[model samples]
Target chain A: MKNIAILGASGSIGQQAIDVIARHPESFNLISFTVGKNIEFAIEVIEKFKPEIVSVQDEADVERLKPYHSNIVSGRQGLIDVSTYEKNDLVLNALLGSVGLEPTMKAIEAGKNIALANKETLVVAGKLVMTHAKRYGVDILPVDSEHAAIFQCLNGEDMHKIKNVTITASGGSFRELTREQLEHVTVGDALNHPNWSMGNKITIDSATMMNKGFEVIEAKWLFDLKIDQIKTILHKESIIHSLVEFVDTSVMAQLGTPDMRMPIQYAFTYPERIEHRAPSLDLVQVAQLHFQEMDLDRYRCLKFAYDALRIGGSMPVVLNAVNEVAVAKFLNHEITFLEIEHMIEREMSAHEVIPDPSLEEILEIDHYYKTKSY
Target chain B: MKNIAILGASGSIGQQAIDVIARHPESFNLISFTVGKNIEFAIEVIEKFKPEIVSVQDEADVERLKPYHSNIVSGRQGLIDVSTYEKNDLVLNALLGSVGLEPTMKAIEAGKNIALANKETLVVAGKLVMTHAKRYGVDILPVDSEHAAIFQCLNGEDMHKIKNVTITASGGSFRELTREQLEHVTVGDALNHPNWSMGNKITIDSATMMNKGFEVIEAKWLFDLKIDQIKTILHKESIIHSLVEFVDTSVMAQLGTPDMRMPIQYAFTYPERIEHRAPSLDLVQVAQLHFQEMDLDRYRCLKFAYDALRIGGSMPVVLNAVNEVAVAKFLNHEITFLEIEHMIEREMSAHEVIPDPSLEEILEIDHYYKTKSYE
Candidate 1:
């Protein structure tokens, strides 16, 4: 059985990962986990799985949990400690935001395989993370459906033969809205995603299609592709996850029901598929599948992402940081939906890009933009 | 360079094979060929390719061609002789009907790889052909689009992980027509296929969906799948050729512009893909792709093929033989579109199946059904 250390045990992806691991008791063992502050759920997790080590947000929570668990640790250092825990075979970095980046680096340094669910880790410092992953001989398996689908299509395929990689987008919440229509959209309007039910920040990211743009940056590092090689198309159903076109003009695509557990299960048992609890995709019932070209003008954030990727290095880092802050501003109702793209554009133009930034420089620039006002 | 012998060089698939080989002269050479009485086209092929040996239908046609070509062979023995020619590295059996079966057997025994375009060779005697192919250590690469698509999808996948193989059909010329409407469909109506321009016999087979049925049986031996493991879906546009669903519920589909050259090039270069002149499929242009369930009742010929496969051994031989004769009768205006399936049903009902039939017995049953007429 593969021993697992989950970094974000109280989040949605974390809960789903636990469910998947729980279903496959014969294959996976949850060795350790870190919960942010959800002590109620933390108590439930500790009771059920009985992990060897548990990390909470602070010393107070850790002291409160000491009654039931002996190896309870707290804070950021505790997350890193659990990440580099000796007996763990795989570290599932389901942590949200840039906090996932440092622990991911530590997990790789410790030579643990990573089932990565966080998009920011790659978007903020993809070059550094991928370089370390290769140097340490650690496999960074993608837990996101789009990347996992592309990875599946590229299975047993020659990388040199890959002509293009196409990732599908569900057109998001404000898909049918015009630019004028999007100008007045509220935080609630943007959070109403068409397909997937996700967290508030990611739901707003889906509205502006910045998630797809972030995925483009993520795909570039993960697949080792040129900026021109990756594309995002409009597929409203969210059924066909992604496709890879070969040099011979033959396209191999992966399709399934929109389920996070499927990709999570794939990440846990890669190259060997087990039964999943999710419903299988039925094409006849879906009746018709559609594909359309991405409108760069409508979803300006998506265009900005491609531009940042082409600019290289610190630009993508700036894009992710600005988008994260801008999405938060929109969520807090301090800015309108369209202002998210406008604010990102203003931040992108103001920053002078670093051609090759180190991890310190990356975090410095991220803090610089995130703390800056529009 | 892989030396190739193109059987039925004047046919559509044969000509396309020649084009593919001609484009990649550095990779392939046309060593020998056989034609069926198309001396006019045969003369052009001879002058262009300059094959070492050429086979014709009759001695008269062979004599007619002697002045232009030195090595001229004729008739059934001539076809077999050219198939086993020493210099050939692969035999491309694009011949029509049960005639492809014997040459395919001979090529396998000769230990040449087969780029098989003829579905009849597998349908009539899949057990015998597959056993021989395995025994001789020869690869039988599929030239049909559906099977080629499946082969491409299964390139690096473990065979044990396969859940099912789904082949798409274009629903042919009469797909929209009702069962009552099909009873009145003329030879002209049946021959007009929606997606592909193919031979008349196969065109009629498409209209009745017997081609897909035959492919189900063909897929059985090709992929070593059970009868229930194969499914046929009606995809009106033939853009998505086929798909293979793994045990993971992840379906890998191969799609391209409806072109024969892509699959032909793929078979010519297995495990490696080369550039082709065919247009790539545009999903945006195809705006919508669709799939639906296959109604066996509407296409009885298709149902008959499955039944024949389920029964095993001699039944498939009878199914193929009778369909050929019945399609010919329909093409000649002697029978209606519905009678093709009726004739097959009648022939299938009359036959007593042999569980393990030899090559000779296969040919005997084939001839027995072909000669029998419908009143």
Candidate 2:
């Protein structure tokens, strides 16, 4: 059996990854995992799989959960060990933000194949992490549905004659609402994504189209594609996950019922498709799927993301950093709904460039904005 | 150079195959061909390509055109040698009906791969042709758009876990009309297929959905799938030509603009897709594609085909032979449109099936039905 280690076992993607792992008990084995203060979740998973090691977000969590597990560690170092531990065939980096970056770097350097859920890792420093992964000859499989689809479509295909990789957008909860109408858009509605049920942070990220932005950045590094070669469309259905077009004009697209388990399972058993636990996609039931142009003006957070990606170096880290703070303020009812893009754009314009950043510089930039008062 | 032979050079599909071959002169060399009484079109192709051998339907045409070309032959034997010619790499069987079958068999024994537009070859003797093809280790490439699409989608895939192979139908010209509405429907409207420009016979076949039924029989042989596993859907746009589903629930579909050349070009350079001369498919521009369930009731000609496929032996041969006669009579205004299926069903019920008929028996049964007459 292939051994797996998860970096954020309590998160939505991590749990789903566990669902896939547990579904194929004959195929996958859990060696270790790290989670936040969700000790309850850690206990449930621990008893289920009897993992060798466990790590919590804090030292207090480690002490409290010591009765459940003999071996426990806390914080960044613990997560890093969870990733780089021996007996691990693959690591699933499920922690959010730049926090996911260092562990990813350490894991790849330690020669572990990565199934990445955190797009922020690449958004912070794609060149550094990707170069390291390449040097070590590790397969950094995409856990994001869009990248996973691009990955699947490129099966038995070449990138030299690629026209573009089209990423489908569901336009989020506020897709129909005009900018003039966002005077008092509430967090309650923002959490409701059209296609998927996700955590508060990502749901807001969807509303602003920032999640799609991060996807664009991740795809650039993951597939080694030019920025202009990455395209987006407003496909509200989210049924067509993503598609690729060759120079010959023949297009290949991977379509399924909108589910995270498909992509998560693929990250585990790639190059070979197996029976998925999720319901099959029914296009006849979906009946009519619509396609339209993406309006960048309507989704300014997406535009800010493109600008950050194009500007390079310190800009992307600043955009994601400021975006986290702005979204938090919006979530706390201290800022307007539209102010997220305003804040990110302002920080990006004011930031000085670091053309090529070490992990230290990326962390400092990430920390500086996250700590800066609104 | 990849030498090629065309069996029905004057037919619509054969002409399109020539367009693809002519477009890629450096890649393909036309060795030989056979055509019907369309001597004007045959002469045009001959003057341009200067083929090594030519075959015409009539001996009279060969005598008339002796000034133009030296290597000429006539009729069924003419077509057979044209397929078996040594210089040929792939034989494109574009001729219609069971008339296309023997040449295909002769070609396979000659150790040539087949690019088949003639679904009747498989429909008549799927077990026989496919088994012979398997024995000889020759590829039977599908040139029918649906089968071609099924071929394209199955690249780097397996048939073991296949849920079904869904074939898309344009539903021809009368897709919207009801059974009562078809009572007085003219041949004028039946000839008008929505998505494709085709010859009168096949276009009429499209309206009757006998073409789709024949495709199901071909898919059964070509893909080695169960008859029940072959499914059809009414997709009026015909953008999504066909698709395949696996046991795991993931779907792979092949789509393109409704042009014959894409499949025609692919019949030559398969396993490696080259630059298509046709405009790329614009799903956005075409925008919305519609899908609905296939009604076997309204399309009884299709139902007749399915029934024939189930009956096997001399039954499919009888169905096809009777269909060609019924269509010809309808074309001649000697019968009503709906009377075609009625006639075929009556004949199928009356005839005694010869189980596992040889090629000679199949030919005799086909001749019997076609020559049986209105009496």
Candidate 3:
């Protein structure tokens, strides 16, 4: 059984990670985890799985959890404490935002394999994390649907054999909206993402196509891919997760029902699949699926991502931090839906990329951009 | 480093296996081969590849081949000689019809691995062939496009974990035709196979859907699948050759350009892959591929196939026996297109399934069905 530590036990990805953990109790052991200020859910998890360490957002919430469990830690240190715990074998970085980057590195250094869900962790600090992951020889298994699909497709194959990969996109809630129509579209309009049941920030990112952009950045670091080797297609059905074409000119793809639980379970019980609670993908019932060429002009956030990833090191840090704040503003009705892309574009356009940046500069530059007003 | 012997050097599959062999000269060595009446093409093969043993259908063709190559053998014995040749590592059973069965059995007993394109070899004698194949621990690599596609998809997967497999059918030249449209169709219409450039008999078989039926039987024996475990769907473009759904609900499919040579090359290269002359499949260019449910009522031959496979032991052999005769007669214009199904239907209806048939009875039964007239 794999001993587990989850960094975001209260988020959507973390909740599904809990469902997968509960689904296969025989194969996975929930040894430790961390939650935000949500001790109500933390109390439920502690009662159910009885983890060794339970970390909360603050000491107040940590104290609130003391009545239930003995080993409890708080804040960023609590998150890292759960990440670097001696009993944990896999650290699932399902936490949102750049705060996950340090904990991911600490877990890697502590010789724990990672089931990474937070793509932001890679977008902000990919090089340092991946280099340390490589240096430590810890497998950073992807928990995102896109990378999990590619990772599953990459099974029984060599890296050099990969000709190219096609990452499928859902085109988001405002896919039918023209650039002019995007200006007046409400937060309610973008929140209605058709495929996955998701949180608000990503649904807004989905509307801006910035979520796909972040995935493109994550794809580069996670798979060690060339910028030209990856292409995204708009497959609205979300049944075909992704495709990989080999050097032999044969294409292999993975298809399933749109479920995040599968990817989380796949990462945890990797190289060994077991029965899952999610429904199987039925193609006959799904009927027809469509594919169209991704228009980079229409999805400027996606274009910004390619530009950020191409310019290298600190530009992505700048792009990600600004976009995160701007999307939060868009959610709060401070800015229009289209303004998020403009905010990211302005920050990415003016920022000078620090060539081959170390972790200190990456962390500071992220902090530098997050505080700036649009 | 590996020696290969082609059972039908003049056939479509053998020629492509030759191209693949020529493409990878450092890997494969063509050592021996058997040809039907086509000594002209065999002479060119013998001139270029220079095999040690050359087998012909008759002494007349053997005499014709003697000038170009030494150690020429002829007749059934000649085919068996090449099949059982000690130097051969892989015996490519690319031969046509039921006559290929004995040679396949001989090659298996002689300890040579097989790359099977002659699916009729399995249809007529799947139990005998597969049992002996298992007994000898020989690998019968599939050269048929559908099997090769599933084989490629099954890499690093377990057999017991398979929930079901959807084998794709091109739906033949008459795919769009209504059941009533098939009644007065000409041989010219039947010969128009949309995808592959193939010979007359199999093309007629394709229009009739017996080719799919035969492939179902071949799949059963080759993959050790239950008759119910396999399903066929109409895929007009023939792009997604086949798909296998594992118990975990994940589907793995193999797709490429509609080139038969890829399967032949895949069969030869088994686990290792190399560059070949075949063009890559571009899905963007391919644009769209369609899948539909197969209607057994419209495609009677596919229905006949399922029925034949379900009856077990002797029924599939009998189905193969009569379907072969009916297809040839239809091609010769002695029988109507629908008469093929009627001939098979009547034969299978009357013939009592011999419980666990022996090879002796299977061969005679095949002969027993071929001589009967549809009239």
Candidate 4:
């Protein structure tokens, strides 16, 4: 049986992955896992998977789950241990924000195939992660539906033949509403995504289009492509996930009904495809697919992310660290929804440039931004 | 320089290949060729290509082209000589009907890659040709747009995962005409193909849906697929030439502006795509695509072709041979358009079962059918 180790096992992506594994019991074996501060939810999952090893956000959560006869590890070391576990064939790094970055590297060093859901790891150290992964021949499959579609489209042709890649987004709940309508938008309204169901933070990120900005950075690293080759188009159907055009002007698009499990399953068995039990996609019934240019003026986080990428080295790390804290504070109702962008912008303005920072230096910058944002 | 030889060099597919080569003269060197019975056309092609060796359809055409200061060979021997010629790296078999089958094999045996336009070569001897090509490791790239589209769709996926193959047709000029309207359809009306331009014979075949039937048989050999895996759907725009569905239920379709030159250029430089001047296909302008099942009662020749594939062996050879004679008779105004089907059905009914005939035996049956159709 294929052994799977899932980090952030109690989160939304983790739960969905477990749901996928439960559907295919004979093919998969859940051997190790990690969760954040939710000890009760972690305990429930630990009882079900019976993992050999488990990790939590802190020592207290680890102690809380230790009574279940599971080998519990906690804190940063705990994350590294589960990521570099020897027995696992695949490691799913779904931990939110910069927390997933170190573990992503550790998994690559251990020669484990990665099903990456964390775009932060790429935003922070894209070159280092991609370069090492290539050197080790460690496959890093994408769990994002848009990335998965672009990956599928890249098949059956020479990589150099790609002219450009266009990733589609639903433009979230804020798409049609005016700027005046935006002032009246509540957290509850923002959380309701038009196409996908996901965790609270990502839902809000989609509303602001910070999620699309992160995907552009991820695409650049994953495909070894230049920034100019990546483009984003707002497509509301969520059917045509992405498209790639060749030098011959032939465009290949990968379309399917919007579902996380489809890309997740594809992530595990890529370069090999299996039949999926998803709803059939009918282009005619969907009737039309539309495209509109992204307005950076309306979505300032998108402009900030692009500016951070252009600046390079420790800047994106600062941007991500600041955004994570700001989003967390917003989730707690401590700040208004629009204040998330203001907090990040304020923290980003105060940062000193650190050129060609080591991983340790990058982590130090992340810590500094987190404290500054708070 | 890549040495190239085009059989039937004066014909439509042949001329398009020349048109592609003319744009890139430095990449290809035309070495040997054969043209049709029209010697004036043959003389002009000889002046242009200046091939080292050449062939004609028969003795009279050979005598007509002999004065062009080119070495001329005649009949079946000439077809074989052009294929077996040592200097050529690629041999293009573009001749119509069963005449192309042996030359293709001769080219295969001589270790030449083939840019194949003649679907009859495969319709008559699919098993033998595919088996021989596989054994010799000779590349046989399809020159038809539908087959090329299918070939493109099969790229980058496991063959085991392909659930089915769909070939697209434009439904020709008589598509909207009722059965009563079609009964009075003249040769003038049938020859007006909507999407593609070609010779008179293929145009009529397209009108009757016999062209699509021949493609099903050809696809079975080209892709090493079973008969049940192949099906045809009428696509009026003809932009999407064909499609393939994976076991995951996702279908891959290859679309292009209808240009035969795209497939021809693709065949020559396959596994390496290049930019061309072919018109760009816009899906918005096409707006919508339509599919419908073919009506076999109205197209009996198509039904006979499918039945013949199921019967196997010498049956396809007989089917091809009888259709060739009947089409010729129809074109000559000796019989009505519907009488072509009558002659094919009669010839099929009179055939003795030959389950696994040798190539020679198949050719002999072809000769017998041709003679009997005339009698």
State which candidate has the highest lDDT.
1
Q: What is residue B272's positional error in candidate 4, in angstroms?
A: 3.5
For model 3 chain A, the run of ten residues with the poorest summed lDDT = A277-286
**lDDT of candidate 2 over A95-213, digit per residue (tens):** 87778988999999889999998878888888888899889999899887788878867766656767777888888888888888887678887776754466577778888899899
Residue A39 displacement (Å), model 2 = 1.3
Q: Each candidate: RMSD to true structure? A: 1.9, 2.7, 2.4, 4.6
Query: Candidate 4: where are CA atoms >4 Å away?
Result: A19-27, A37-50, A168-194, A199-213, A231-241, A248-257, A275-374, B38-50, B63-69, B176-181, B184-186, B231-236, B249-251, B274-311, B318-353, B368-375
TM-score of each: 0.96, 0.93, 0.94, 0.83
lDDT of each: 0.85, 0.84, 0.83, 0.79
* lDDT of each residue in B241-311, candidate 2, tens digit only: 88887665667676677888878777888766677655776666876777788899989888888788888
Q: Can you give the DockQ of every candidate in the order shown?
A: 0.65, 0.47, 0.51, 0.24
Give TM-score values for chain A, per-prediction: 0.97, 0.96, 0.96, 0.90
**Can you write out model 1's per-residue Cα lDDT over B1-375, one digit (the tens) per residue?**
888898978888988888998888889888899988789988888888778999997888877898899999898899898899989988888888898898889888999889888998999988799999888999899999898888878866788878888889888899998898876777777777888876788788888898999899889999999877898888988878888887667777888777777777777787788777566677888888888888888877788888999888799998888888888887888877788777788878878999999999988988888887566
Q: In candidate 1 chain A, where is summed lDDT lowest over 10 consecutive residues?
A: A190-199
- Model 3 chain B: which ten-residue window has the lowest total lDDT? B270-279
Task: List, in the given order, the native-contact fraction of each candidate.
Answer: 0.66, 0.38, 0.36, 0.20
Q: Candidate 1 — which residues are off by over 4 angstroms?
A: none
Give the range where candidate 2 chain A is weakest over 10 consecutive residues by summed lDDT.
A191-200
- Model 2 stretches astray by more than 4 angstroms: A64-71, A309-311
Task: Single out the weakest 10-residue window by summed lDDT for candidate 4 chain A.
Answer: A280-289
